[PDB]
């Protein structure tokens, strides 16, 4: 640009006109085994629709995601991919973690049986069998009702979905932990599913 002033009328001058960001996420080996098993379908939703550089240090058991400034100008995408890998590593399935990528209002809540009501040993065992139900039937009922997804660890219980959805699922599973019979659980279940289907 050359430099020269143009003096307009009333003496007025006249001119003429003239960063990566990364995140790291660990993975446990029991979760790394299906990660290695189904790694192939993990990156195609993100590297193509979010344009996020991926690396995975099996030396460090972690995954790295880098936003390039010219290739990507999208603020929440690295964060969304972080939520995606967090959900999967927490134990949720690939399609529901992708569902979390599709939406932005999908939220996770985890909690513990000792946080709600501490129980011991075989009491905890019978309680886990109760909250599971016969062959996860009750868990499926909860998931279908609240439209939520549940992950049942030893004590960590993870619930993915909408805010009030996981709220309702939390109230239900708190009832199960405290000792609710599954029939009255089913009664309240079709009640809450009735109002949620009516809305």
């Amino acid at each position: 640009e050359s430099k020269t002033v143009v003096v307009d009328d009333q003496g007025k001058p006249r001119f003429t006109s003239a960063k990566f960001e990364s995140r790291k996420i660990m993975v446990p080996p029991h979760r790394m085994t299906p990660l290695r098993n189904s790694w192939t379908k993990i990156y195609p939703p993100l590297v193509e629709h979010l344009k996020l550089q991926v690396r995975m240090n099996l030396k460090t058991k972690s995954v790295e995601l880098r936003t390039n400034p010219k290739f990507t100008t999208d603020p929440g995408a690295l964060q969304k991919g972080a939520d995606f890998i967090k959900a999967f590593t927490l134990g949720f399935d690939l399609d529901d973690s992708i569902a979390l990528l599709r939406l932005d209002d999908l939220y996770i809540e985890t909690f513990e049986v000792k946080d709600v009501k501490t129980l011991t040993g075989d009491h905890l065992s019978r309680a886990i069998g109760r909250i599971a139900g016969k062959d996860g039937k009750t868990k499926f009922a909860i998931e279908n009702a609240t439209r939520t997804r549940i992950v049942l660890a030893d004590s960590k219980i993870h619930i993915l979905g909408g805010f009030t959805h996981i709220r309702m699922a939390r109230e239900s599973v708190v009832s199960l932990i405290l000792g609710s019979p599954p029939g009255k659980v089913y009664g309240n279940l079709r009640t809450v599913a009735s109002r949620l289907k009516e809305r």
């Binding site: 790694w39 550089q53 690396r55 099996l58």
Partner: peptide
């Protein structure tokens, strides 16, 4: 069975 990922940076920018 060549896996971008574990090896080096697998991204849209470069490799």
């Amino acid at each position: 069975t060549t896996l971008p990922g574990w090896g080096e940076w697998a991204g849209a920018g470069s490799k």
